[PDB]
Design a protein around this ligand. Structure first.
Ligand SMILES: Cc1cn(-c2cc(C(=O)Nc3ccc(C)c(NC(=O)c4ccno4)c3)cc(C(F)(F)F)c2)cn1
Length: 268
């Protein structure tokens, strides 16, 4: 763990309050005093009292993964506490919480360009994870955190049929291209302001429908460019899906605001 995670001194951590009502795990917000004496807001996940050795190993392995990724759109590991208990993982604080729950509070209240900025941040984080050989496997709006300035950052709270590509469902073929499929689902979630993908369809029907070529329909008022981007991410042939670098490039062009062309499952 210490290869990729700094050991924090518990005397530098103050705990404020419980956050997220369990959605992130056993997580609090608080402050961390850095070696330079600067104090920053942080999220703190604690390992349960009475943990088993496997639970500790799994907890510290998580920190080890996170510590590998230093990027503006991937959740930043500040460090771990292992030499005292409770054992902790400390990250930057993301004031606006998970993106799906945030958007549900704000239905139709953001501009298209604001939503595209969110989407671009997520794609940039994924471009770095993929460049680093990391396949996320659970890329979903609930695993994206959003801060006070609406910057979105790839996270993972653990457990996902609705977000999984057909090949990863069929025979566990997980690649960065199956993450691109997942990104198309997140793109739909964002444009739908946190609607659940495939709503409450039976999992077996989500699997069969997608395999038969059916896809989620355009969100209300969804620009054609963005719906086409979803369809491109949802290509049956993983080789035909765009790479994350190309997704970032697409969004960067839309950010220049060229987009006013507007578009149960659709046979696509
Ligand atoms: C089992 C496992 C999970 N992960 C993993 C966890 C996480 C992650 O986000 N973990 C995590 C751990 C501790 C905390 C405190 C947080 N942050 C928050 O819960 C949070 C809430 C609000 N602000 O921050 C987040 C991220 C990544 C990713 F994709 F970015 F590479 C991977 C790796 N292995």
């Amino acid at each position: 763990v210490h290869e990729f995670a700094k050991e924090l001194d518990a005397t530098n951590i103050s705990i404020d309050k419980v956050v997220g009502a369990g959605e992130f795990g056993e997580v609090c917000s608080g402050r961390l005093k850095l070696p330079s004496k600067k104090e920053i807001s942080v999220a703190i996940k604690t390992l349960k009292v009475g943990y088993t050795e496997k639970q500790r190993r799994d907890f510290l392995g998580e920190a080890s993964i996170m510590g590998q990724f230093d990027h503006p759109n991937i959740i930043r590991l500040e460090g771990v506490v292992t030499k005292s208990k409770p054992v902790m993982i400390v990250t930057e604080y993301m004031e606006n919480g998970s993106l799906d729950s945030f958007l549900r509070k704000h239905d139709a209240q953001f501009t298209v360009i604001q939503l595209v900025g969110m989407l671009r941040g997520i794609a940039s984080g994924m471009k770095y994870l993929s460049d680093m050989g990391y396949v996320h496997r659970d890329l979903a709006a609930r695993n994206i955190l959003i801060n006070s300035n609406l910057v979105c950052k790839v996270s993972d709270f653990g457990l996902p049929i609705r977000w999984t590509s057909p090949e990863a469902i069929a025979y566990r073929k997980f690649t960065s291209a199956s993450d691109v499929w997942s990104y198309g689902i997140v793109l739909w979630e964002v444009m739908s302001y946190g609607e659940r993908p495939y709503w409450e369809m039976s999992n077996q029907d989500v699997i069969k429908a997608v395999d038969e070529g059916y896809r989620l329909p355009p969100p209300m008022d969804c620009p054609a460019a963005l719906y086409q981007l979803m369809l491109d991410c949802w290509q049956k042939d993983r080789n035909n899906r765009p790479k994350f670098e190309q997704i970032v490039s697409i969004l960067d062009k839309l950010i220049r605001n060229p987009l006013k062309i507007i578009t149960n499952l659709l046979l696509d």
